[PDB]
Design a protein around this ligand. Sequence first.
Ligand SMILES: OC[C@H]1O[C@H](O[C@@H]2[C@@H](O[C@@H]3[C@@H](O[C@H]4[C@@H](O)[C@H](O)[C@@H](CO)O[C@@H]4O)O[C@H](CO)[C@@H](O)[C@@H]3O)O[C@H](CO)[C@@H](O)[C@@H]2O)[C@@H](O)[C@@H](O)[C@@H]1O
Ligand SMILES: OC[C@H]1O[C@H](O[C@@H]2[C@@H](O[C@@H]3[C@@H](O[C@H]4[C@@H](O)[C@H](O)[C@@H](CO)O[C@@H]4O)O[C@H](CO)[C@@H](O)[C@@H]3O)O[C@H](CO)[C@@H](O)[C@@H]2O)[C@@H](O)[C@@H](O)[C@@H]1O
Ligand SMILES: OC[C@H]1O[C@H](O[C@@H]2[C@@H](O[C@@H]3[C@@H](O[C@H]4[C@@H](O)[C@H](O)[C@@H](CO)O[C@@H]4O)O[C@H](CO)[C@@H](O)[C@@H]3O)O[C@H](CO)[C@@H](O)[C@@H]2O)[C@@H](O)[C@@H](O)[C@@H]1O
Ligand SMILES: OC[C@H]1O[C@H](O[C@@H]2[C@@H](O[C@@H]3[C@@H](O[C@H]4[C@@H](O)[C@H](O)[C@@H](CO)O[C@@H]4O)O[C@H](CO)[C@@H](O)[C@@H]3O)O[C@H](CO)[C@@H](O)[C@@H]2O)[C@@H](O)[C@@H](O)[C@@H]1O
Ligand SMILES: OC[C@H]1O[C@H](O[C@@H]2[C@@H](O[C@@H]3[C@@H](O[C@H]4[C@@H](O)[C@H](O)[C@@H](CO)O[C@@H]4O)O[C@H](CO)[C@@H](O)[C@@H]3O)O[C@H](CO)[C@@H](O)[C@@H]2O)[C@@H](O)[C@@H](O)[C@@H]1O
Ligand SMILES: OC[C@H]1O[C@H](O[C@@H]2[C@@H](O[C@H]3[C@@H](O)[C@H](O)[C@@H](CO)O[C@@H]3O)O[C@H](CO)[C@@H](O)[C@@H]2O)[C@@H](O)[C@@H](O)[C@@H]1O
Ligand SMILES: OC[C@H]1O[C@H](O[C@@H]2[C@@H](O[C@H]3[C@@H](O)[C@H](O)[C@@H](CO)O[C@@H]3O)O[C@H](CO)[C@@H](O)[C@@H]2O)[C@@H](O)[C@@H](O)[C@@H]1O
Lengths: 140, 141, 140, 140, 140, 140, 141
Amino acid sequence: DNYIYSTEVGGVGGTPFTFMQESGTITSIKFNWSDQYKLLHHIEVKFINNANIYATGDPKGNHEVILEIDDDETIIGSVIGYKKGNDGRCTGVKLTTSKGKSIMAGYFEESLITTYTGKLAGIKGGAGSDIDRLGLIFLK
Amino acid sequence: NDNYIYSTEVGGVGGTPFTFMQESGTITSIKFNWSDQYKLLHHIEVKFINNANIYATGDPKGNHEVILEIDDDETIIGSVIGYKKGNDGRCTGVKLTTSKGKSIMAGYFEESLITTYTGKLAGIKGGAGSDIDRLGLIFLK
Amino acid sequence: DNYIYSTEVGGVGGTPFTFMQESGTITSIKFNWSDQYKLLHHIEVKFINNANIYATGDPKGNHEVILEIDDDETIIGSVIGYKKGNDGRCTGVKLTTSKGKSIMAGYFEESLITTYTGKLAGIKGGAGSDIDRLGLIFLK
Amino acid sequence: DNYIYSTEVGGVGGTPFTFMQESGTITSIKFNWSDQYKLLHHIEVKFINNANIYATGDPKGNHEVILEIDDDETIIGSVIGYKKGNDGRCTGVKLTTSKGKSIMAGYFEESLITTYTGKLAGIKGGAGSDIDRLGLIFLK
Amino acid sequence: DNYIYSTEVGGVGGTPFTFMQESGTITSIKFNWSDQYKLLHHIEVKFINNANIYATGDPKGNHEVILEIDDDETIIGSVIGYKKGNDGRCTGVKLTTSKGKSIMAGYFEESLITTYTGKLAGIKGGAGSDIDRLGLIFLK
Amino acid sequence: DNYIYSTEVGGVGGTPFTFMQESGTITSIKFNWSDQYKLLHHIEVKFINNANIYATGDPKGNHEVILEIDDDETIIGSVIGYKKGNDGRCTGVKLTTSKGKSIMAGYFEESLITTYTGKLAGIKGGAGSDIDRLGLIFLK
Amino acid sequence: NDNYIYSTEVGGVGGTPFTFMQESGTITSIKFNWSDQYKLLHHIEVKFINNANIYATGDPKGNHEVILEIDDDETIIGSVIGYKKGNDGRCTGVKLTTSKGKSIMAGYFEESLITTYTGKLAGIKGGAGSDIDRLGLIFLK
Ligand SMILES: OC[C@H]1O[C@H](O[C@@H]2[C@@H](O[C@@H]3[C@@H](O[C@H]4[C@@H](O)[C@H](O)[C@@H](CO)O[C@@H]4O)O[C@H](CO)[C@@H](O)[C@@H]3O)O[C@H](CO)[C@@H](O)[C@@H]2O)[C@@H](O)[C@@H](O)[C@@H]1O
Ligand SMILES: OC[C@H]1O[C@H](O[C@@H]2[C@@H](O[C@@H]3[C@@H](O[C@H]4[C@@H](O)[C@H](O)[C@@H](CO)O[C@@H]4O)O[C@H](CO)[C@@H](O)[C@@H]3O)O[C@H](CO)[C@@H](O)[C@@H]2O)[C@@H](O)[C@@H](O)[C@@H]1O
Ligand SMILES: OC[C@H]1O[C@H](O[C@@H]2[C@@H](O[C@@H]3[C@@H](O[C@H]4[C@@H](O)[C@H](O)[C@@H](CO)O[C@@H]4O)O[C@H](CO)[C@@H](O)[C@@H]3O)O[C@H](CO)[C@@H](O)[C@@H]2O)[C@@H](O)[C@@H](O)[C@@H]1O
Ligand SMILES: OC[C@H]1O[C@H](O[C@@H]2[C@@H](O[C@@H]3[C@@H](O[C@H]4[C@@H](O)[C@H](O)[C@@H](CO)O[C@@H]4O)O[C@H](CO)[C@@H](O)[C@@H]3O)O[C@H](CO)[C@@H](O)[C@@H]2O)[C@@H](O)[C@@H](O)[C@@H]1O
Ligand SMILES: OC[C@H]1O[C@H](O[C@@H]2[C@@H](O[C@@H]3[C@@H](O[C@H]4[C@@H](O)[C@H](O)[C@@H](CO)O[C@@H]4O)O[C@H](CO)[C@@H](O)[C@@H]3O)O[C@H](CO)[C@@H](O)[C@@H]2O)[C@@H](O)[C@@H](O)[C@@H]1O
Ligand SMILES: OC[C@H]1O[C@H](O[C@@H]2[C@@H](O[C@H]3[C@@H](O)[C@H](O)[C@@H](CO)O[C@@H]3O)O[C@H](CO)[C@@H](O)[C@@H]2O)[C@@H](O)[C@@H](O)[C@@H]1O
Ligand SMILES: OC[C@H]1O[C@H](O[C@@H]2[C@@H](O[C@H]3[C@@H](O)[C@H](O)[C@@H](CO)O[C@@H]3O)O[C@H](CO)[C@@H](O)[C@@H]2O)[C@@H](O)[C@@H](O)[C@@H]1O
């Protein structure tokens, strides 16, 4: 494609999602998580030139974080926390941008991926009550 | 919209809506009032370049205030708003860092956070009553 | 004007002062404060090409600090501590210059202003036994 | 050659492996380890333009970490923790990249190697239930 | 003049001194102080191309510090500690140079001046048993 | 020579060694040490274009560290810990390279040398059960 | 004098005078010995470039030593000597920092200090017996 697909980490459960838009990049991303379950539960994404909110999961966590991304702003550091195996889950995400902005959502107590970097174009994975699995998508 | 970038308004749906914005103008001063009692922002005042008027919203009942004065060439390079999410949400805190290494920290960051768009601060929008129900920043494009 | 007026922070009390000189900038500023009251009590300013000391307040504090400012030296960082409201006071001042000089006077327990920056031209406010309120004045 | 072979550290046990691809570099590396044994147990590698997973060891650890490596991204810092001698094992790996990405797997309580640096081309060693020994391979 | 006169800080007591030499700058300065009185007691200065030691005060303190200054070396940071008022004294001096050298003499428990900076040309003040008052002198 | 010989630090005991190779530099160095004796016991060196391991001492320590050195990589900081006198020993070595790699072996509770720096060409000293004395050798 | 800068000799008037200097030579190595018992320097050794001789003064009775090796192009950019002042004075400590980021710290800094001239270290001068009574550094002009 014109795209780099980072590994989807977590389990095989939930309903698949792919959030990507032709000629579009992510302008906003929101992560919801709980202290009760130490999991991500819900993600929302907006793309440039598109008022629609693309949402997956169940927003039942007691915390959320939003990162807004300027048009020229890239991801220079990216860590996803997860529980591995078929019954796995995403537990946490840390993003750092080319403008020194960062967010930290959830927990990093089991497994980690340090992903590919670049301009964040989309996300892919599976979600039900929780985020079962998450992979980032970048421009080439 | 072709001149402005609207950061997400974070917090609840309550209070009276406000938009503090002036044509050809940017914010020269912003004041945040907050309480240790409620751990909320209660009151915001803004001045714009070439305008002696003070634009105020909320109830200045907090025991703390912070003022940031912004030089004409000074931009926001880092911006975090703390809030309680949901319909009955509130803004709890704001942290701003400028291109000249100035910063302010008001209030509390214990629940939800937004790391916003950056640039030249043109205005603010949201809702306020006794508290700041919700706050969104506005930047020049 | 030729001048930028920073917000006067503190209360409405004391006797007004405005210390400014045409074609002049502050060459020296002195702050007097007490541990007993945790307030500024007295300020003195000198201007270039002027031997006069312009003083306001009551110099009853147990501490003073002086900053001398070279002709080409600007203020790049300025924080004033104060108690807000009609019965407010200035409690503290921190200044940092373009030559890496700094001073710290008094206390920062309640409210703070981070002011405009530039060439320090004057001060304005009110003073009696204490510094009720203080605003810095810069060259435009 | 076109390759720099870092010292294989650990013991003489397990089944030998050499994972390298001519005109290929590692795009992804995964380390599995346990708190129970404080050892690495399993490694997987993928090469650019190749969906096949090269795996060695037994993935029985309770933790894994993945590092994804951009095509232009090199290793600038590399530490392997191991137990020395014939009955040795690899206990840990830390990698830092030219883009400021890092991973840390396992434990560093006995012996350490700080390896050669450069573009990670492959791995070599021996593995059974555990990673007995590991050496990194770089482009010249 | 060719000179910048920093404020003399401390009291009105002791015998006046001015140490300056035409076309000359300070090559060496020594400060003597006591733990008993927490005051400066004695200062000695040497100038380039001049073997004479210029001394004032009474060298009765239990500590001394010497700063030697290279011909091209300027003062980039200067703080004098003092007790304010007519019966004041100098308690301390801190100097930092353009070559990253620094000295710290005495105590800074009451009042402070952050002085003008530049090439140290001389000193002026009053001294008896102690240093009553001190001002630095720089080239323009 | 073409060589700078750092001071051999430690005692006069053990069997002398000199590890150098014409037109060669050290590509790998290993230090073995014990918590029991808080001494270095054994050193191994490899040179570029030479598969031979040059070893001295007795590898009886419970720890080892290896530093691999890229062909263009120099030592920018070097500290050797030792026990002084005729019955002295080397207790520790810390090396930092031009690529930001470092190793720390053993203990620094007694004496220290901060050595010459540059391209590490060889080592010289004496060794028996312990490393009695160690000196580094650099290119001019 | 047309080739050398003499830093002040600090400490007392006691011990046997020494001057360690070699024409067209600079210090390639310097060793300081000191004690926790007396909190003094006791012994100094110096080597010069192109000279296998060790120049030593004092009594090496301290429980600590440090050595600084100096590359031919390496200068001193920071230098502090700790001492006890007066006729019966002593050197208690030395701290050196080089143009290549090397440093040593020997002994104690509890009484008096000199921050010296900087440059290429050519030699040392002073007095020594059981202790280092006094020490002055010598630099190339
Ligand atoms: O901006 C927020 C709302 O402001 C207006 O509504 C006001 C709001 O004020 C209450 C009030 O709560 C009191 C206690 O009942 C409460 O338990 C305690 C919190 O521990 O705080 C007070 O003692 O004030 C708090 C703190 O400022 C407010 O956060 C809280 O919402 O609601 C009151 C109840 O309806 C109302 O009387 C006030 O006028 C209003 O503009 C609304 O639309 C805003 O959302
Ligand atoms: O600039 C500040 C004001 O100065 C003038 O008023 C002065 C003000 O001084 C008081 C005084 O407080 C002390 C006692 O007076 C007080 O009763 C006590 C207990 O409440 O606390 C202190 O001991 O001094 C302090 C320290 O200077 C001041 O902070 C405090 O405001 O009030 C005095 C008596 O009412 C008055 O005599 C003083 O002259 C005046 O210019 C006023 O306008 C200014 O705001
Ligand atoms: O990679 C290492 C070796 O793997 C293969 O052999 C395996 C090896 O496994 C043992 C085993 O030890 C467990 C118990 O068997 C042991 O008695 C107990 C004592 O404290 O500790 C463990 O519970 O598993 C551990 C954990 O992985 C290993 O560290 C340990 O080596 O040995 C087994 C029998 O001796 C063998 O059956 C296993 O397959 C083999 O390929 C060998 O060459 C490798 O070195
Ligand atoms: O003859 C000595 C100097 O006289 C003039 O200086 C005066 C001199 O007075 C000192 C002073 O000493 C006391 C304290 O002030 C001092 O701080 C303390 C510790 O040093 O020790 C004494 O207690 O004052 C007493 C007065 O009681 C005098 O007897 C004594 O000579 O020193 C003062 C501090 O520098 C100074 O202020 C005085 O003017 C001066 O003219 C000088 O030439 C003489 O050497
Ligand atoms: O052979 C005599 C030495 O003479 C010259 O040096 C004298 C010498 O005096 C010391 C000194 O020792 C005590 C303390 O002063 C010392 O600091 C401490 C730790 O070293 O140990 C002793 O307590 O004085 C004693 C007697 O009071 C002498 O016996 C002893 O030798 O060393 C002094 C310090 O350097 C020096 O100032 C003296 O001039 C010198 O020629 C030396 O080589 C001789 O050994
Ligand atoms: O994404 C998680 C899962 O959601 C759906 O299964 C749900 C699951 O909920 C469990 C538990 O797995 C979850 O962590 C906690 C907190 O969110 O809730 C429940 O404890 O399983 C329960 C019961 O089996 C279901 O009620 C619930 O739907 C489903 O879409 C699945 O595919 C997905 O993996
Ligand atoms: O390199 C040290 C020493 O080695 C040889 O002497 C050995 C030495 O062992 C002692 C003690 O020196 C050492 O710290 C520990 C740990 O290695 O072991 C022993 O307690 O001294 C013993 C005497 O008992 C020797 O037999 C032993 O071989 C020798 O090559 C010597 O020259 C060298 O300094």
